[PDB]
């Protein structure tokens, strides 16, 4: 008898351009987002 088993070893690695994802390259949006702290850098570091 053959028992088949799948054990995953990877997931798809995703890096997100936080600035472009949130603001789409708009200066007003970037100025408004800067009030939220260092969100994009922390997101980049976490994903990396």
């Amino acid at each position: 008898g053959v028992t088949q088993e799948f054990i995953e070893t990877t997931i798809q690695k995703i890096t997100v351009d936080c600035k472009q994802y949130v603001c789409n390259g708009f200066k007003k949006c970037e100025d408004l987002l800067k009030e939220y702290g260092q969100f994009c850098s922390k997101i980049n570091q976490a994903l990396h």
Partner: protein, 41 residues
């Protein structure tokens, strides 16, 4: 203090040579074309 922040503002470009202005000393004075050169603020 002891923190790196991203700032958006009025800053010079990196490795910018800029414009150099040289002044001399004199009777009749010696000057360049600076007074007739109008730059853009």
């Amino acid at each position: 203090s002891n923190i790196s922040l991203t700032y958006t503002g009025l800053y010079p470009k990196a490795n910018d040579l800029g414009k150099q202005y040289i002044f001399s000393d004199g009777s009749r004075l010696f000057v360049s074309n600076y007074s007739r050169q109008v730059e853009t603020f």
